Design a protein around this ligand. Structure first.
Ligand SMILES: CCC[C@H](N)C(=O)O
Ligand SMILES: CCC[C@H](N)C(=O)O
Ligand SMILES: [Mn+2]
Ligand SMILES: [Mn+2]
Ligand SMILES: [Mn+2]
Ligand SMILES: [Mn+2]
Lengths: 294, 297
């Protein structure tokens, strides 16, 4: 609809994974008209840029690569969100890799009182619930939700003011799951719709399950990894996985999420314009537009 | 670059109603597309953007002395008031137009932000003095009138936007070369300081900067209003009233670099970019001027 303001945080983070370019996601969305999209929603946009680390990438074998750079980015991001989050306005974080989702959830939790119930909708091909001990890659972008729930190294889990719980999460579109993540999903009974589930039951049913799930929560946070979307439409991303959510279902999903009165914050992550720029960037802008009702 | 601030206030002013050609209202949108936000990112981690409301009313086509006065009034009032709230002597404010009719709102805003006794200096980089009135305008296009309105010469609905008037002695013109009879009369009769484009060639831009430093030494603040058609049309094609024999790109960049170093400068207008006339060459050259201002090179 329209807000008095939108807080827009640009998070130029690549250190959660190995491929260069995902840090330029904000820059390229701006080039494709992101500011003009925000202009339809609010006359005031407060932009914040999180500081880009400028160190060499750790390109060798490790269980948690560039932990320093992920820590420092998520700390700054948490603290910025803690100051700018507002239940009467909207906050949009543009990444950057999905390692920023730790900072992003941490920020919403820090903004709210200690007793607040915070819901998380995680639209992604991946559950992002690995740890350094079970990660096949050592790429911290596959770990943030584990860190948010208290599973991970101390320097990352401690970014949370307190942990969220597995019950607070709704997964949407997941289809690439590692053994540790499967274990968590089944052992903690984490609510989810795989990509195939979405096909079977339809996105309307997904939205209904979200409304029922978070009915007694204070706020909902959406974390939207563009690789949730089928690679036919989203090519410019580091870990594409086939048989994803259709563009059509993604736009309906975003439209319906945008209507939820408990939603005040959104992450759009994993746009790597150096992999593919235009088709992807424009499709990402359609998702963001749908969210806003444009 | 070299400049770093806690914040930059960025005001987008999608105004075409000061003249007849469509597209100048999209100047902000197209500068954003060409990387304007990423240029601001070199200067400040916080950018507070404001968009002035775009009027969506019919263009007054047909002869008149002041076309679409309503739209120019309402835009300049909103712009003045926005600037009055956001102007900050420790940070930087940048208004992106839009036609030069917004320069009335923009000066009005700086004057409203300051105490009533403040001395406000205006540096006006332009091919045109923009000092016509409705009675002597050859066009009725209000973008040729704002500085006249700022000094109290114009219709009541525009001159009254000023909290109080600035005076002719507060202005320093740079690059002027396309002057109407009424504007020449004001320049000569009020002894308004100026360097024509030819003058700049003769004496050099260094001498221009020195004259500005000496002129405004006892002022409180300086406001720069930069009409891109001040620049020679070799480099700036995407604008509605191009005039040949302008300031070179090189002299424009040096000018902007030196302006950016002035401690009294806290606000800048970049106006008359029409990307529907020409987009890329112009837009990129405009971004170089803005970069120079901030010390980025
Ligand atoms: C994007 C995450 C991919 C994989 N699960 C990993 O942990 O590398
Ligand atoms: C842009 C200025 C053009 C002319 N001096 C006029 O006053 O219409
Ligand atoms: Mn993810
Ligand atoms: Mn993913
Ligand atoms: Mn002008
Ligand atoms: Mn001009």
């Amino acid at each position: 609809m329209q807000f008095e303001k939108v807080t827009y945080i640009a998070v130029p983070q690549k250190y959660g994974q190995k491929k260069v370019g995902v840090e330029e996601g904000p820059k390229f969305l701006e080039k494709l008209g992101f500011m003009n999209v925000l202009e339809q929603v609010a006359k005031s946009v407060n932009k914040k840029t999180i500081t880009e680390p400028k160190t060499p990438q750790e390109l060798g074998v490790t269980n948690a690569r560039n932990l320093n750079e992920v820590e420092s980015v998520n700390i700054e991001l948490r603290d910025t969100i803690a100051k700018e989050y507002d239940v009467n306005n909207l906050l949009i974080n543009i990444g950057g890799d999905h390692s920023i989702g730790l900072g992003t959830i941490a920020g919403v939790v820090k903004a709210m009182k200690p007793n607040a119930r915070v819901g998380v909708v995680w639209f992604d091909a991946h559950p992002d619930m690995n740890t350094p001990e079970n990660s096949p890659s050592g790429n911290i972008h596959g770990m943030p939700l584990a860190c948010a729930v208290g599973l991970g190294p101390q320097r990352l889990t401690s970014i949370m003011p307190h942990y969220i719980t597995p019950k607070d999460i709704m997964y949407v579109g997941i289809r690439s799951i590692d053994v540790g993540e499967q274990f968590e999903i089944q052992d903690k009974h984490i609510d989810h719709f795989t990509a195939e589930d979405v096909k079977r039951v339809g996105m309307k049913e997904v939205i209904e399950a979200i409304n029922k799930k978070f009915v007694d929560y204070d706020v909902i946070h959406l974390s939207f990894d563009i690789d949730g979307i089928d690679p036919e439409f989203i090519l410019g991303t580091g870990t594409p996985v086939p048989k994803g959510i259709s563009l059509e279902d993604s736009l309906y999903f975003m439209s319906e999420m945008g209507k939820m009165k408990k939603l005040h914050s959104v992450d759009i992550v994993e746009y790597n314009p150096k992999i593919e720029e235009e088709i992807t960037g424009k499709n990402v802008l359609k998702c963001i537009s749908s969210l806003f009702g444009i």
